[model samples]
Each structure stands twice: as structure tokens, then as C-alpha cells.
Target: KGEELFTGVVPILVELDGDVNGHKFSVRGEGEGDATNGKLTLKFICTTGKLPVPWPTLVTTLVQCFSRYPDHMKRHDFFKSAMPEGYVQERTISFKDDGTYKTRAEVKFEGDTLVNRIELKGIDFKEDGNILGHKLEYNSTWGSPGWVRLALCLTGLVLSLYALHVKAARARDRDYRSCSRVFSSRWGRGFGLVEHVLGQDSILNQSNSIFGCIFYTLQLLLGCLRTRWASVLMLLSSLVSLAGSVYLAWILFFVLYDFCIVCITTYAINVSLMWLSFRKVQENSHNVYITADKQKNGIKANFKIRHNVEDGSVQLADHYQQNTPIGDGPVLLPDNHYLSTQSVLSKDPNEKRDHMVLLEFVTAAGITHH
Candidate 1:
């Protein structure tokens, strides 16, 4: 069953094809039974004419078979077998010759190490059939339950911190609520109005460039090589250093080339991944609407953004657009959304801060900058 309560896994039988006393045989077992008190029982069906002599020898050899299935045992019952060789073993409980009987198994947990001592007490054979071998069990060592639990906790903490940041920047929480309300409203109005102008189609077009593709490719390669993070960093450093050497023209050129493209690609990738990761973190914990907007747009007719810790509403003017006329002189629009330094946050640190200027039509002739 794939239910959440199934924390412990039972070992599955697999790779079973063998002959018992010159007769073809198969093995099967059902219903989970506990291994406690140095005892366990297994009621299995086997092919006909696969009984004793070699059967006794096989049982002696393979009695403590549970060791191969490490993932199925609880934290305490791992490997603790104490079956004797060449011993006359009888079932303590009555079992009919042709019917199935329940088996009782028990093992004692030693310490925190999960090693167990096992004993079998209630195994009965009805028209005995040969027992075949079973395969080993597997469980996740890296992405186990413990790791998921920790990740869930960490994700929750990150979201909480993000909410607190928003709360602190609220209008009611401040002495002068005028600027906050106006800002929120302006953002909302701008976002609603500009979707026609700067919709997904336009944004995707803006990102479609030769350099953009190269950058995105290199960005993916960088992530793929993050298994060797130190080596990648050193390679980047060497490329940067050799850029001054005329003899290293290819290295230097490619370094700048990849860097110019890759940095922008990385920024875009990060932004996209952040959105996905944020949503995934919430989904994993089954949390819903924890941060839904508590406030609405403060000012009317102005672009505003009302964001709950969970739900986010952004006005295009407030966050997406820079208020300049896409070219030179600052043009005043009908609303108070003027181009400012606080407009679009520059993804680049070294790039000039004229990001506040949103002039259009000046460089309209095949201008492609990522």
C-alpha cells in the first residue's frame, strides 16, 4: 500500500526460478507477520514433490534469510538469526498437511545499531514443496524520511521569514501609511494595465536571443557540473585571468563570451527556479493559503500590489515597468508612475543603474540585449 502510514517496508520476493528435487518450483508468501521473541513464521506455497533430504539441507543453509531484506524490517529488527544446522525442528502449533498455517518469529534488538537476533518457532509444511531464494531489499539512503522531514521544516522557516519581511513593510505597521498605500496601489494599477503591452508573449520574445540561448546552455552545464563546484570555479577564474594573454585568445574570448551570456541566463534560471521551489515546498507539506493576502491595494486608480504571505498580487507599473519613454527625456505619464531607481531591480551588479529609464523606439532597430 502507498499510504503515508507505511513507513516500514516489507521485503519483496524476486528473481525466483529454481528446481526442487528434480521438480520445477516457485515460492510465494502473503500477510505481514512480526519477528519478535526470537521467532517468526512463513506460510508459503511451493511446487509439488519438492520435500526433505536436500530440503532439510537447504533449510539449514537458508534459515536466517531475512538478512537480505534490510529495508523491510522496523528500526529494531535487522539481522539477528540463530537457526541451528542439522537439527530436528517441529512446529509448536498444529498445521494441517495441505493447509496454510501462521508462523511466529521473534528477535531481540541489541542497541541503536538495528541488529537483531532471530529465531523461528511456528513453520509447518503441508504436502511440502521446495522453498526458493529471494532477492535483497532496497531503501533510499540519501532521500530518506528523515531528510524529507528536515527539508519540510527548513522550507517552512524560509516562508515564515519571507512573510515577516512583508509584514514589517506594511502601511498599518508604519507611522506614515501614505507612501505605502500609494506604492501598493500604483503597483496594482500598473500590472493590470500593462499586461496587454508586456504580456508573456512579449517577455518570451525579449528573452529570445542568440546570446540568450548560449547563456542558457552554459547555465545548464554549470549546474550539471556543480557536483564539482570547486573545479568549475577554478576553471572560471583561469579563463578570466587568461583573458589578458594574447596567446590565450580562444580561452579569453570564450570566457567573456560564455560569461556575458551565462550570467543573464543564470539570473533568469534562478528566478524561475525560485518560483517553482517556493511552490514545491508548500505542496510537499500540504499547506494551503497560509500567506494569502491580508491587505488590498491601498490607493485607487494607481498600480498597486496586495500580497499575502501566500498569495501575491503585483501591479505591472509598480514592479515590472520603468516609467521613462523608452528613450531619453523623462516623460510624465497620466498616473504618478514615473521612472525611478527603485523600478526594476537590476539582475546585474556591474550594469549601469539607468534601469530606471524605460524609453522605447530609440533602439528599435534589431536591438537584442539579454
Candidate 2:
């Protein structure tokens, strides 16, 4: 009469995301069930819309719920056949099951847009529905989405490039009137300003915009990479940008009466990016190794981990190796912040939920990937 999952097995509390056909889908759920004749339950803690996967595909993992499901397991099939590097053998359910679980599965079709029923459906179907009806709230996203940061970075990049264009143009002494007035006035040169690097002519000032655009690009690229280091660098650069914005804001408001939309706009994006950077950093749970196994209809995954600095140091050698705790192909590392979560989870009863060792991504490629 009850739907349950992820019991003796480590529990899960995060969003599982992927794009099917073309639509991006996100489903947040928590799990708790350990093989005491336990049923694997996917409690929809949060969901935005309908889940449209075919029925047959959806019920594979749920069936395994009755098997003596180990803390980890792997699969051997065409699912892992098509793409070697992009795919891997999914056997164990260790803390290594996080990140991108790619699949291009083929489902059977019966007559008249057939209504397939996986009659052998898990000991837990209605439970999923009932739980879905009962609402609960918890939040977690290591490999967080970043279109906001990306868009803001793009905005800032454009602003800097336009200003620099003006700089180069005005250097040719053209009547770039509007932009010229604000940039050149008394604030353009030395002294009438506070000190060095504070005025427009200062090397630091010109370089600031130049580097700002470069940084914008850097942030844009780094934003796509979901890793703790990437997030750290992003935050570091965000703080620096905010610091510059504060300086410019004060100068614009009090010190200098220079009113430039470009300047104001630039500062605006800086603050936005700073806030997003912090948000994103928090979103990126360092050391969280989520094992997201892409089941036909959904995903089966879990994780826990210290390879933070260790992962960083040896990643280049891997391209990733010891860092990844599974026998999957090239370590799909958009997010593996399991260690930090592991540390957080340590406060629980001393029952060594230690699937933490990855229990290594030993790929057939002869080398392991993390």
C-alpha cells in the first residue's frame, strides 16, 4: 500500500534533466528503498510538465526493483553499443551514477498506435501517482542550468565590444560625439580624477573594458562547463567584476557626473552576473557524484564522494580517470559534486554508505574516465 525507494541504498534528492526528441524535460524526485523486498519508488518532489516517454521504455528499472538490487549495477545492451565514448556499461549502482546518461533507444510499435502495458510493472505504480499528488519540497542541482548567466555574459560582452569600438574610433579622432563626451571629458585624462587607473586614459581603464569582454567570453565558455572549479573561477571573476562595477557606479553617481548608458548597462549586467554567479556556485554542489542512470522511461542514479582537488589535479591525465567512480566511458563530468555531499551525509548513522569509491570508470577504451 506504500511506494518506497532508496532505502539501505543511498537516498537521492535532486532534479533529473534531459532533452527528449527536442523538448527539454526536468523532473525532481527523492528516493528511499533498500532490498527487503523493497520497491524502487520515484517520488516526484518537483516536476514542471508531463513525462512523455513510451511505456515499455519507462518500466525497465522499476522491474529491477524486485531483483536483489545491489547498491550498484550495470547494463549490457545496444543502449551501450551504438556510441562507445558517449556510452558505457552500467552494471553497479555506486555513488558514480551521476551526470549525463545518454541514450537513443528503440521502442517496439504495435498496431494502431498501440497502448502498451508493462503488466509486470513494479510493485509500485499507483504509489508514484499518490506520492506525486502529495507535495513536498527540497532543492538540489549540481549541474545547474545557466542560460541566465550566459545571456547576461553575452549582454556584457556586447557592451564592452561597442565601447571599445568607440575607443578605437575616437583614437582616430572622429567626432564620436555621444560616447566621446563621457569618455573624454575631464575624466578622460589624469589628475582631475583621483589617481592612476581611475580615469579613462589610464591603461587599467582601457584594459578593463578590453579584459571585461574577454572575461565575458571566458565566463560564457566556463558557464557551459558544470564543475566546481568552473563555478569557483566564475565566482572569482564575478566578484572582481562586481568590485569594478562598484567603483564605476560610485564614479558615475558621485565623483563624476558622466552619464553613459553603456556604462550603466555594463554595471547592471555585472551585478546580475554576480548574483547569478553566486547562485550558480551554490547550485553546483562540489563533490556531488550523482548516478543518473538513463532507464528507458527515466533514470536510475545515486552518488556520494573527496576527489575535488584530487579530481582537478589528475583530470588532465584522465582527460579523467581515477576521479570518475564508474566503468562508464569518458567521464561525463557536467556534475559530480558527490564528495561535498558525502561529507554532509557523514553526519548520519555510521553505516558506511560507502559506494563512494565509485565502486572507477574503467571504460573498454583501455583507460578509465572520471
Candidate 3:
């Protein structure tokens, strides 16, 4: 019965010669008494006995066999053994009509027992006969997210090629370097490390022109990769990339006061990816926190504390106060001690400092204590 949970039709090559109503099915159960007494026989007209069937179609057949043809259920030993190895459903990329996609199946069998895992493919269905149609139609490519990433990488690669070509032309024309006019020319001086890094052959400029796009796109992909270390790396990359983008943006806007289309585009890509990467990191951390909370006690406890601003005192549980975690940030002084107008009989400075430190801890932990 447990095995039946995963049952499905198996596809295998076979030959059957039979007429519409002449198809026959004979099944038997194990044991001698009630089991031996149980038997099943079914006769149905099928177009082809060798055709492979989808899981849902096979499941429908089993359901019909058990209901209208009750005797077929009792005697069919095949039902207990036809568990599928695996199944998959995919969306077609090109076609929009629901009828364009078709499901197909492939399986292996040996000596009346399925040998290999069953393969179920496609998303559309069309009823043909007692066994549902298994005719395959169209294949699909990557989903929308995958296509978007590929497009971004290709754009980066193309821009990189253009930059390399410009670099080569600049090297060939020696006069272009000596002329102060070329630096201001619309063709060569709009963006990039034109003047700051090197005397026309700066190592930093050369390195960026050659490998910048490739490395940036690779970083974007790595940030999206679904692994613990990969995700952490992505977060780090996002911070670094954002810093670079902001710096470049500032130089392009204020320093040069000129718009470099290619540079601007690259910066935009970096900014977008940086934001996306940060979002992924944030979501992952939030999910992890939630998971840890669930594992610890399947319930969330909300603790509250009150603070008296006038007296600079806080009301907290004795157990919590004793075991308070050290916190970071601005210390909240007790009794206005920092004002230099405190009474001589005010609380001890050391004791007041401890309360101030506790407030700092609360602030760092983002807890409301009022």
C-alpha cells in the first residue's frame, strides 16, 4: 500500500496484435483462501497496446478500474508494482496556446516488471482513447529570469569589446595623446579613466577595459547562485560594487560634468544588481532567523520593558536585568549626570554608568523600553 503512493504507468517498447474489443486483461492475487478466491478480468478496445501513457491518464484508468470495473481492481497484480521512478513538468517557451504543448513518456521494463525510472514530460493534455495521448510536440528553453541574466551578460560582453577597440585605436594614433584637444573630443573623452590613472597607458585603466565587464557579470551570477558561501560572497560583492558605482557616478556627474552612455549603463547595471543582491541576502537572513526561532520553541515571545525618562530609570525583569547582554551605541546617562547639575546625593557614578550601558544595549538590540 505504501508503494502504491508512487504508482504510475511505465513506457516500454512492445508489440500487441489485437482488435478493438478483443483486448484482454487477466490478474490474480497471492495466497490460497480469500486471496485465491479474488480474481479480475477486463476486456476493452484500445487503439494500440504498445503506446506509453502519462501518469495522470494511468491514474484515471486505475480509478475507473476500481469503480465501474470493480473486479479488475481485485485481480490486477500490476497495480501494486507500477510505481514510477520520477516525473517532471515543464513550460514551453515559444508557444502561448495551451494546446501547443503535449506530454510524452518513456520507461523501461524487463520480464513484466519495470526496470528503469519512468520519464514524464510536457504540460498539455489531449484525450485520444482509453490510454491518453503520449505524443510529444514542442521543447522549451530557460525561464524569464534566466533569459534576463543572459541578456545582461551579453550586453556587458559587447560593451567590453567596444572599449577594447577604442583602447587599440588610441594606442595606434600617437598624435591623439599629445593633442590636448583629443581629451575633450566627443569621440574619445566622454568617459572612463581618460586622464587620472595613467599617461594614456595606465595599468588600472587597461585592466578595467579588459576584464571589468566579465568579472562584474560573473559576480552577478555568483550572487544569484543558491549556496551558503555563494550568497555570502554575493553580499560582499554587492557592497563593493555599490561603492564603486557611487564613486563613478559622482565622478561622471560632478567632476567631468559629462554623461558617458556606456559608463552610465554599466553603473546602472551595477546599482541594480547591488540592490538585488542585498535583497536576497536580507531575505535569506530573515528566513534563517525565522527557522531558528521555530526550531527553538515553535512560538515567538514578546518581552517589554518600561523606562522613566525623568528619573532615567528602567523597569526590567530581575532575571533579564541580571543576564542582560552587553550592547553597543550611545550610553543613556542616568539622573542627568552628564548635565553637571546633578545632586551630590544622586546615584553612584559607576552604578549610573551601568544603567546607561544597559540602555545602550537596548538601543543596539532595537528593543523598545518605554
Candidate 4:
């Protein structure tokens, strides 16, 4: 027996597995009839303490699956149910929240199914979850511009803000805080001036983290977190906080012999933020350049980079601006050419107010231009 779109069909009980983006995907889909007769719906859900994968990732996988696996949804009554009762992918976190595993992002699809030939329709899908004002779909990029990093930074913001409030309220004597053994220890109230100058949980530290989160959020929204130098600075800021954690934790255990939950929590957040920025810088460093076709010279290849004299902001090579997003720096794309970063400031403060510099490169001539 055969149908117009398909050659033959039978009962099909099938499962699919994938590494969709960074998240593991174990899939089961169900349908009936000509198999290609109507549609195949792929519904994705996760267990307690587990999260549904990102929306973008789900969309990506949906298209990817549709495009490739031609024989996936084949039979009528193949599966009695949609399957995956307990689920397929193993939870890496190994715990249970049972509160809002859907807190991440989730997507369910109604695929317009035509197994092998040509079809389109159920590409229609929807995502649930929000961040700031956007759907919380993290493409799982290493740093900012994703839900993971933003949420991590936001966590830091909350912890620091709370710790700051408690310390200040206790100072104002508006609160009774003799209970916090760690903060009130002999070492807690440090040498009077030193606490003001270089205090750990002092007003200075909390404000610093609050501002740090703001800075990260700004970079994320402005879409510059992947810029090499900007990412470097981000890593440096978090690195400093992580370094502070070493001494902070040491004092908490060895000397105070007590636990400050928020303190240690912030310390962990700091390290996480540092790792995010570090990995981001690593990801951005991968520059696989090809020939920049435009703006070529007689014997050389060239591109232009603009410099803002007033504020020292840098712009990507003017000729190659299309792929460059966010004017301050280049987020590496394939064949992304860079500007000559050498800053040559003249002694005459009256030199050019702004420098539009052209940088050149000797191309394949390096090997064959005899």
C-alpha cells in the first residue's frame, strides 16, 4: 500500500536523540494515518528539577529534524502514546526543585509533517519564559546576550544588595543582628578606618557588585559583551571578586567558625560570572579569517577603522562594517577582519581631532608573487 507523498507506512515506534545546542535532547513524536497524511507533533517536556531547553534551540532542532530525518514520523498507531514518561535525557544537576523547571525556556511544536518529499506548515511553534522584556531564549552563548549570564549576574546583584542592607541596618542600630556570628565576630568589626577603606562586605563591595551587574546588563543589551577588550575587562572585574572570595571564605571558616549564607553565595556567583566572561573571551578569540574582498589596494589589501578622538571609542574597519555589530568593537564572525589597533598619538595635541586610519595587509602574495 502507498500514498501520494510516501511509498509505504506501518506502525512506527521511534525515538530520537540529539545534542541540540549545548542541551541534550531525547525526543519522541506520535501521529497516525498516511504518516505524512496529517502532522507529527513533537512535544518536549522535562522532569522535576530539570528545565526545558531554550526556545531558539528548540526551533533550531525542529527545523534541523524536519530537514534531515525524512523517515522519522512514519507509521500509524506506531506509538500508543507520545512516550518519554520518565524522560530520556539525564539531569546533570541531580536534584529536584519541583517549583519551576519551566523557569528556563520551553517550546512545543506542531510540525507540518511530510516525511520525505516537500511540505511546510507546522513550523508554527511557541516559547514560554521571559527575561527583561524578551522571551527567555538563551542561545547558550558563553557570556552576555543570553539568559544564563544575565541571570547569574542578577543573582550576584541580589545577594550583594541583601548583604549590604543587613550590614547597614545593623550599623544604624535599626535592626537586632547579634545572631550573625560571622558578621559580628571579633574579626567582623574590623579596625575602624580599615573597614571603611577596604571592607569586604562593606558598602563599597555591595555597591561595586550592584554596579557590576548593571554594567553587564548594559553590555548585554547593547550587544558588546563579546568584544575582546570589553570581555577582557568584564573577566577582570569578576576575577577580582573571585580573588576576594578566597580570603573571605577562609575567614568565614577558619576564624569566624561560622556560616554567612549570603556571603558565600555571592562568592560562588562571583566565580561563576568570572567563568562566564572568561569562556566568552575564549569564544570570541576564535578568529578564522578569510580574504576581505573589498577595499583592496594595488599590491595590498586594506580596510579602514575609525577612531573617536573625543572619547577614545574604536570602530571597525569602515569598509567592512556590515557584519560588525555594535560600533565600539568587533564581535568575531567568520572572515572578520580587524583594524590595526596600534594607537599612534602625536605629541601635538592639535594633531587630527579624529583619526580615520587605513590598515593594509599583504595577501597571498606572501607565497606566490614572484
Candidate 5:
């Protein structure tokens, strides 16, 4: 009779030493496997415990155990209870099967206590029959998950560095204030405003409240700064930096749901840059308008002065013609002729004495012959 070694909801270690096919072997139990869910851990040491048995023989024997009592081995509950408080085990030996063998082991743990385990379920290794001497000692925990996480962090770091560069440029270019010192850290100014206004029909419409509100508001502010279409190009690029900072901030707060001080500080820095840019835009607009208005006034004044000079020259020519003796001098000089003669020569001798007075009167009075 095969004696029952141990029986309970909690699993107990099973040790078996036996000869199979003239090969001496010892099997030792390790992991939890009993009444609810877990896999039975059986380490097979062959050649009288001097070396591990090859995978072919171990899998062959394991399948025989499963075949002898298929219902009991496959369907019976084999879960172990919660590990005892503070129980610790050094799992120095780990085994992994990389699909070459049809049998593989999976382990799940609660803290340091190993909990759930899985073993071969859906394949038969004997069908191939040629698998032998395959290495069975491997640790599968060093797979892609950790590398994926590392890659994600590296990507974030690169973005953060770029953000830092943009913010530094903003500070140097605009004299803006920044709340954060470290790396971290709009509008049509594109279609942000148009899409927002048109909602779903917009070419680049945003569907989210955060993006729509922020971008639309940013565009409105930029529009207020639209003094010159030329300078607006540069201003729009600065707004892009502001947008990047806000996006990073949104990810930290909304998606990750973490209150990161660094993210918040970067957001504050962007806001500060926006505030300063707004002031600059306003100042630039004021200066441009003032300059335009001054130019308009200057143009009108110069035109008025030129008109006065022509009118004064015409009056002087007429006075010279009217005052001169027509018979003694040239016949009543034509207006063009008199003006041309006066410009080339002096006025009549009688008129010369009065010329200074006439000139002073015209110059001081700014004579307009209404």
C-alpha cells in the first residue's frame, strides 16, 4: 500500500527517491501546491543525485504520472493556503522552458511568498520523441517588460531635455520668468482656433476639453497680439513651446494621476512665458500703431509745406508781372515766363527794394491764396 505522506489544504514537501529504467534518482518538492491552485514543484536529480536528469526522461516520467491518474492530477484542486506570516524562502534554483519542451512553469507571488503557479497543460512532448538533453535551468524574469519600462523612461528623459532647451531660449529671448530651473517643462497663431470654432467639422478639431479649451484660449490671446503678421510667425513658435509644457503637465496630472512638483513648476514657467509674451505683443502693437500714425501725420505736413512753397512762388511771379512796366520791359509776362525769369534773375530794380518785405510776408504768413 502507498502510504499517504501528508494531507491538508496547505501543501507539504514531498521527497521521493527511486529507480526508473535502471537510473537512480531523487525528487524534492519546492513550491506551494495543494487544495486551491498552484503547481507541484518536483526537482529531479538523477545519477544517484550527482546530476540533473535530462529533460526527455523527466518529462516522460511526469507524463506517466499525469496519465496514470489523469482525472486526479488534472482536475483535482491543488491550491496552497496563504503563506504563513513572515515566511521567507531563498529561491536559488529557477527553471524555465522556452517552448522546446511542452512543459513550462509559471510563478506568481504575493510579496515574497510564492502564490500561484502553472505547469504544462495542453501538449504532449512524447509525440516528437527525439527531445533530449535540453537545458532546463533558466530564469524568465529578465524578459522584455523591464526593458520596455526602461525605454519609456529614456524617451521621457529626451523629451524633458528638449523642453529644457525651449524654456531656456524663451527666458533668454523674452526676459520671461520661469518657476522651474530643471529640465521639464497654440494656437493659429494653426487650426487650433478654427477647429475649436467649427467643433467636429474643423480640419484639426480637438475632441477633448483640455486641448480645446487650452488651444482656443491660447489662440484668442495670440490674436490679441497680432500687430504684424510677420512678427506673429515668431510669436506663434513661442506659443508652441508653451503648448509642449502644458501637454507634459497634463500627462503627469491627468493620465498618471500624480501630483508632480516638477511638472507643475514647468507649467508655471510656461504660463509665465505666455504672460510675458502677451505684454510684449501689446507693447509691439502700440509702438507699431504709434509709428504708423506719426508717419501719416508727417506725410500730411510735408505735402502741406510743398503746396505752400508752390503757391508762394506763383504769387511772387504774379506780383512781378503786375508791377512791371509792360511796354518798357517784356509784354505782360506770361505766368510761366515771369516765374522762370524771376527764378533765373533778380526782380525789377523798383521791386528789388520791396522783395525782402514780400519774401518775409510769404515766409512768415505761410500765405494761402484762398
Candidate 6:
């Protein structure tokens, strides 16, 4: 009865909606059940449609589908066949289930007369409600089988390094911040002693200390930008600072002779302190936080935000972040005008179904890697 309705003396009309090239056709056929058998028969069909599908529509479809099946590479063949073509299917098989046929396929062509002979063993049958008459099991991998070992090794190394650096920085930061708690209560009296006696007040106050450091750092940086012999200028600045501190301290001490020796002691202390702080800064650099973005597959990822200046008016010195995955890293960039969504739309007008896919990646080491 169902067969008669599909291709017989009076075929029923059905709408094959969706893509044309690689389309998904919905077939609705109505006819009386076979009187002798008293069995009701039905048929409904949908597909990715035809080739050269409109890129935008297909991309949208792909994205919706991926939400349901994020582990796309290990997907079943039925889903894999849903794709445009040539692109590798992601999750054909699930890690949670050991079903060999988890990503299997079975099909019964519209005009095949040898349906009985095509009934492959171990395949899903039409009676079992599967569209495919025979089942062909499918399996997939995140990468080639050989790459698993390498991925494991690299993952371990990256996680270990991340943990080691973060832990070290945490310890150093704690120690650095803790050094100030003792001096916090002294406030005015302790500070005024150096200010009044030697006019060397800046070293006692943390704000002044930071202020002094900024100037000193700038001077050091500018020295490096000079045309030649910049290192000599840097050495001269350090010597001058050391000499000035000694002269200031000589006015403070009761004995002027002791000032020279004490200044020598101070210079050594200053050099060691500077070296230690620089090392701490280097260690902390890796801990600086970073962010990423997500968007449609094949779409470039770059984003423009406020310019270097935070003002209402736009400025030429604007800033932006790139949003593309880099070697398993997170992507936060958006595509430029040249890589607009219109590009996909202009390819083919007839192909309207869109399939978009996004591959999300995350790792255990505070590394949502992709």
C-alpha cells in the first residue's frame, strides 16, 4: 500500500523541502493500507539536499546540529553524510557507549529493485524502523590513531608547566605583599624622621617608592632606546642615584665618615633587591589572564573595542582583538569586512539550508585551550 502511494497509478504529492543540491526532502504520502494484510505503511524523508549548497544556510544548519552533537568527529555515518562533502566528520562514535553500530548506516534507495539482496547482515532493517535497509558501522577519531600518544604527552607537559609557574608566582606575590604589613602602622613618625633629618622621605613611603620606581624604570628604558652606548648612560644613572643617597645619608648620621661605608652597603643591597624584583616580575608574567571568543565556523574572528583612549569620540588609535584558534588555543577574533557573511550568501541562491559548526576546546590546566 505504501509502495503504491509512492510510485503507482495515483502517486501522492509530497513537498521535498530544504536544500536542492544536497537537500533534505520531506515526503508525505497517503494511501489506504493493504486490505489483505491490514498493515498501515508510511514514509517520510529529509536530506542535506544537493551539492553546491548555499554556504550561509548550510553553515547555520551545521551549527544547530553541532549543539546536539559536540563530539562531531566521532559521529555516526548517518550524521556524517549530512555534511556538504570532503570535510572530515568529527564524532561518529561516542566514548560513553561501546556500541559498534553507534555511528552505523542503513539505506534503501528509492528505485532499488534488489532490496532483498541489499539486505546486508548485522544491518538495521526497515521493519526495525531504520531508513537504511542495511547497516554499515562507522568509527572516527579526534585525529589520526597515531596522534593519541602525542596528544597525551603534550597535554601532560603543558598542564605541569602551567601548575608549576602559577604556584611559584602565588608564593612570591604573597611574600611581597606581606612585607608591607609591619610598616603600615608606623605611618607618620617613622616617615618624618628621614624626611626632616635627610630629606630622604620618598624611600619610607610605599607610594613614593612606587613613584620613584616608575621614573627609574622609565630612565632605564629610555637609555636602551638611545642610538649608541646606552648601557653607559644606564650605569651613570645608577651611580648618580647611589651617590645622591650617600650624600643625603651623610647629613643624617652623627658621624660623616661612616656615611661612605654605609652607602657602599646600601648600593649592594639596592642591586640585590632590584635583581630579585625583576625576577619576580618575570615569573608573574605568565599568570596574566587572557580571554577568548566563539563564533560560526569558517568565519574569521576579530573584534574591535574601545580605542587606546577611553572616550566617547572615536580615535585613529583604536584597539581590537583577533579571534581565531591558534594551535589548539582559544579564538576571540571576528572576521573583517572582506570576510563578511555576504560572501557565503553570494555563492548560490538556490541552496538555502545552512549548517554551522563550532569546535569548542577546553583543558584541565586552566586552559580551555580552544
Per-residue alpha-carbon lDDT of candidate 3 for residues 1-370, written as tens digits (9 for 90 to 100): 2133323432222122211123232211111111121122211222333434321222101110011112322222221222232211111211122222221222223343432222223234234422233332111111122344455556766766776666666767977673233234432431354446455655444444355565566664673444447657877866865675676677767766667777777777667666666655544321100011223211111222111111111112110000111121112111110000100111124431111010000001111233
Residue 289 in model 2: shift from native, Å? 18
Task: Give the residue spans of candidate 2 off by over 4 A.
Answer: 1-146, 174-179, 185-206, 286-370
For candidate 6, lDDT tens digit of each residue in 143-183?
12113223332333343344334445665877977222212
lDDT of 4 by residue, 169-259 (tens): 6667745543386544444333223366786676544443355456445444433333457767777766765665676678778867677
Model 4 misplacement above 4 A = 1-144, 172-179, 185-224, 287-370
* Preferred candidate (TM-score higher): 2 or 4: 2
Best by lDDT: 2
lDDT of 4 at 58: 25
In terms of lDDT, which candidate is stronger, 1 or 5? 5
- Model 2, range 238-346, lDDT digits (tens) per residue? 8987876787677777866767888888878888778867866554442222333333322333432112211111010000112111224222322221222111111
lDDT of each: 0.25, 0.40, 0.33, 0.34, 0.28, 0.26
Please write out the lDDT profile of model 1 over residues 205-293, one tens digit for every residue: 22112223333334333322212342254245334323322222233245333322322333334344334334332322211010111
User: 129, model 4: CA deviation in Å?
Assistant: 17
The CA root-mean-square deviation of candidate 2, after full C-alpha superposition on the true structure, stands at 18.6
- List TM-score per model, in order: 0.16, 0.39, 0.34, 0.35, 0.22, 0.16
Higher-TM-score candidate of 5 and 6:
5
Worst 10 residues of 3 by lDDT: 355-364
Candidate 2 matches the true fold with a TM-score of: 0.39
Error of 6 at 137 (Å): 49
For candidate 4, the per-residue lDDT at 125 reads: 26
Model 5 regions more than 4 Å off: 1-97, 102-145, 175-370
28, model 1: CA deviation in Å? 14
Sorted by lDDT (best first), the order is 2, 4, 3, 5, 6, 1
Spell out the clash pairs found in candidate 3.
Answer: none
